[PDB]
Every structure is written in C-alpha cells, then in structure tokens.
Design a protein around this ligand. Sequence first.
Ligand SMILES: *[C@H](CC(=O)Nc1ccc(C#C)cc1)C(=O)OC
Length: 325
Amino acid sequence: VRVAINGFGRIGRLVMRIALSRPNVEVVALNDPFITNDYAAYMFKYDSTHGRYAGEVSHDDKHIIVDGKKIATYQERDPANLPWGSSNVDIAIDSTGVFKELDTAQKHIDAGAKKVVITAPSSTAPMFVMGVNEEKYTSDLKIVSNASCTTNCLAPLAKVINDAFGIEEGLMTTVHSLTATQSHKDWRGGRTASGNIIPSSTGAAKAVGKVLPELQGKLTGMAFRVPTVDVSVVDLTVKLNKETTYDEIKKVVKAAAEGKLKGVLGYTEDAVVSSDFLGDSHSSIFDASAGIQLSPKFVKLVSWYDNEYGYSTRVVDLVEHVAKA
Ligand SMILES: *[C@H](CC(=O)Nc1ccc(C#C)cc1)C(=O)OC
C-alpha cells in the first residue's frame, strides 16, 4: 500500500515511523509547506519522549532519507497541487488537522489519491475506531477519520464493558497530558501549563456515540490537563445494567485484550505509572489495580494511553484495513 503523508507535526512523524516499519505499507511522499527538508529530518530523528529514531536519517533537496529509503518531499499550501496521481498514491494520510472534512479532504482525491485517512475527528467524514466499528467500513467510502486518541482509548473499553454488562450511564474524566502546544476560545488553556492542573472540556465521551451508536447519549465527561509526559489516563465511572464483580470485569477485559482486541486493548495488573506506557502501541491499557468497584452496578475503570503513539499505530492500522477492502 503506497501512502503519502500531509503534515509533519507529531502525528505525521509518528505515523511515518510506524509506516516505515509496516512491511505492506510504503511511504512515497511527504508534504508540509511550513518546514524545510533539513528541519523535517531533524524533527523526525529526535523525540524527547519516544527516543531517537533507531536508524539513519538525512535529506537532500528533494527528499527525506531514512535508512536509505528516499521519500519525496513537497511544500504545497494546497494539497490539490500535489502529484498523488503521478506518484501512484493509494492512500493519502492527512495529519494537518485542517483538511479534516469531506469537502477539504477531497483535495487529496482531486490530486490523484484513491482514498484519504484523516488523523483527526471529523464532522462530515465517517469515523472509525479499530476494534470498535472497522468491520462497518465499506470500500465505497473514500474519505474517513480515525477519530481522536482519547476516543480511541475510551471506545474499545466501553464496547467491551457494554457488550458484557451493559452501560446504562457513564461519566468520564481524563487526566490528560501536554502532548505539544495544542488562547481566546479556551481561557484556562492559555494559562501556564507547567505548574497547573487545568480543567478542560472534551468531546471524546460524546464521539464514542458516533462509533458505538448504542451508547449515543449515555456518556459525557471532562478533562484535567496536567504537565506530564505524553501519556494520559481515562477514568470511567459507569452505571451498569447487569450486576457483576470486579474480578468478572477483569476477566472480561483481560479476555478481550488477549483475544479479539489483541493489540488494541491492553491489560495490566502491575504497579505502573504513566511513563511505563511511553511507546506503547495499544489504544487503551486497562489498569486493573487502579480501578475500584463500589457496588454490583457501579464501578470506576481506569485505562492508560500514549496519546500520540497508540493513535498513530491505529492510523496505519486503519490505512491497511481501508486498503485490504
Ligand atoms: C490525541 C492527542 C491529544 O489528545 N491532543 C490534545 C487533545 C485535546 C487537548 C485539549 C484541551 C489538547 C491536546 C489526538 O491528537 O487526537 C486528536
């Protein structure tokens, strides 16, 4: 599968690291009008949290070069100008977060790509979360969104819990890290991040309603942003339809993690802390020891996620899936 990446922020760079390692995915091109090839190579080589790339990185006037593989580079403000038809780009991965609707992501189709994968939530493109609703994709949909990293953490765990015990209602808190610098629409967010706990909204709990229609209207929540490494944790307080015990929840989650959700949902019982998940490619790692059940239908469930790395692995997953179709 021949892919091109638009945008070389955190996500585009990690999607590229992962796609270089996928045997059936070939990275053909990169586009980003705001950086030069030498900065792109620097940014790709170094990462404060996910380590130096274990391989050789350089560049020339027309490529970024990774372990010898030359990857053509472009600087187009308008993706309609990119040579995707000429380059034979099967799937364009858009990680700019600005061409994230059906009419704007269309530009990659116009430029010659067969399909587009938006690495950001979308109001108009269909949204897919691996292990939740990817079986619902059909090969006539040409533009799709991988939702958000918090949605990717919550939705697999919510699906498992709802399938086994039913969710009547749930309230979610995410203790959310500073990913990168991501302030006149959000006053709390313009305060110094570095020493503060900063409450914030989130649409993650409601976007689960898109990929799990049966949970529509049954979840909401909020976030506390903290100044830690790029690993966050979801704190899900659910009212259940059916009585259960915490050991039963553990077995159900563990079975899904070892079975149908292998590689997407993880499971631990160790005395973990957030930095133990830097680089973890799961969407959601259930922390069995951190959760707590009060009564047979009322439980707090806890799940970790590297908010860049698991998401970016799911992106390349969705790319292969959309291609396998
Ligand atoms: C996952 C990474 C991420 O969570 N970025 C993020 C989201 C919300 C806020 C706020 C307020 C800050 C940073 C991702 O990129 O999904 C879109």
